[PDB]
Amino acid sequence: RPTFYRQELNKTIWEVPERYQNLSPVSVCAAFDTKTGHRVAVKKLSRPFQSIIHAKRTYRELRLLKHMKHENVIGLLDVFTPARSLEEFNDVYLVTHLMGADLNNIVKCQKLTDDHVQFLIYQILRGLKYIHSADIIHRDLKPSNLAVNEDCELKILDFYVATRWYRAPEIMLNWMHYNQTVDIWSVGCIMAELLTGRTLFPGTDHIDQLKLILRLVGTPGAELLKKISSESARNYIQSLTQMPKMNFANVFIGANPLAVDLLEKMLVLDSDKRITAAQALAHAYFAQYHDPDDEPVADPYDQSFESRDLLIDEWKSLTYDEVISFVPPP
Numbered sequence: 001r002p003t004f005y006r007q008e009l010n011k012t013i014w015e016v017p018e019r020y021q022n023l024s025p026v027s028v029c030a031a032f033d034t035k036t037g038h039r040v041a042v043k044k045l046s047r048p049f050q051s052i053i054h055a056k057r058t059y060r061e062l063r064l065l066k067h068m069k070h071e072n073v074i075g076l077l078d079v080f081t082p083a084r085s086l087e088e089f090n091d092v093y094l095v096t097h098l099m100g101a102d103l104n105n106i107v108k109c110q111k112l113t114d115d116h117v118q119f120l121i122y123q124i125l126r127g128l129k130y131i132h133s134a135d136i137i138h139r140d141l142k143p144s145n146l147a148v149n150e151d152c153e154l155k156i157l158d159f160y161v162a163t164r165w166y167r168a169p170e171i172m173l174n175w176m177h178y179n180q181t182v183d184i185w186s187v188g189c190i191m192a193e194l195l196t197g198r199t200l201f202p203g204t205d206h207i208d209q210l211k212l213i214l215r216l217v218g219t220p221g222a223e224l225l226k227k228i229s230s231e232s233a234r235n236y237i238q239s240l241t242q243m244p245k246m247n248f249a250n251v252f253i254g255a256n257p258l259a260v261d262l263l264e265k266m267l268v269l270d271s272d273k274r275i276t277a278a279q280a281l282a283h284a285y286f287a288q289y290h291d292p293d294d295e296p297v298a299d300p301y302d303q304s305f306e307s308r309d310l311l312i313d314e315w316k317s318l319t320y321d322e323v324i325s326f327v328p329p330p
């Protein structure tokens with residue numbers, strides 16, 4: 001067992017191994033990992049076991065993070081707790097490599113080259129293909145959840161920019177039966193923003209969001225309309241598509257034609273018709289980076305726990321097991 005030390009950061013108590021030094025708030029903390037000389041990000045979970053909902057969420061994140069092993073996806077470098085036993089186990093600390101900045105603090109400087117956009121979007125899709133192959137959906141893809149380094153290398157993460165502006169319409173209409181391309185829609189909005197410099201759908205409330213969206217991708221067609229069980233929902237989406245339509249070409253004039261073609265494939269109202277991460281990676285827009293032999297999928301992920309209703313203490317023990325069973329990668 002390592003030797004921990006306490007400290008208070010912004011009225012917040014932090015107890016971590018001496019290994020991590022110079023903690024700095026960024027709850028998350030940036031630190032210097034003495035074992036490697038590299039800067040890392042340390043995330044302390046709020047009140048992990050305060051409720052059954054928190055407990056399961058805590059477990060959910062540890063398991064998922066313990067399984068993520070992809071260049072373009074946040075990975076777990078270390079996980080610890082000051083508690084010497086399950087009895088006193090009450091805090092969880094997770095560690096990952098510290099990244100330079102968000103995709104938000106990188107667009108507030110100047111419009112990126114089309115080549116720069118190709119590379120960034122390619123990495124998002126490469127990461128997304130991986131996460132999707134583990135039967136996992138992000139649901140909150142946006143610039144603030146994208147970490148990029150000095151080498152323009154990207155990693156996808158989730159902080160527990162406007163979510164809604166990158167949110168898929170079927171989610172704001174509460175159609176509950178979301179498919180993975182819900183993330184592809186977000187990617188489309190992101191890519192649009194990187195190419196034009198501006199937020200594609202800058203809505204106030206979600207209603208305004210929906211309206212802006214439908215005026216661009218068009219009124220729901222017959223084919224999509226038949227898959228909507230609810231009649232009030234069927235009518236509602238139609239009521240929201242009463243604004244003077246707009247076209248793609250127009251909104252992305254100037255951009256690489258390959259780029260606008262891909263956007264027309266991501267920004268499709270009917271989620272069943274959106275291109276997938278895998279297909280997208282093979283799009284000619286990415287001819288320059290695409291490699292069928294270096295776009296890995298994930299090992300089968302066991303999330304049978306999701307369909308479980310257990311007591312807090314059960315979730316807490318399972319989580320504790322995961323903490324002690326952690327073995328750092330090479």
Ligand SMILES: COc1c(NC(=O)Nc2ccc(-c3ccc(CN4CCOCC4)nc3)c3ccccc23)cc(C(C)(C)C)cc1NS(C)(=O)=O
Nearest residue numbers: 028041043060061064094095096100101102156157158160
């Ligand atoms: C919320 O839990 C999830 C996490 N966890 C997660 O993202 N956790 C973390 C998110 C963010 C930082 C972080 C914070 C700040 C900085 C430093 N910033 C970098 C940018 O510049 C400013 C400073 N760097 C990293 C972390 C650091 C250490 C450990 C975990 C961290 C990841 C994922 C995907 C694999 C699908 C993406 C899904 C969920 N969802 S789930 C399992 O619940 O379903």
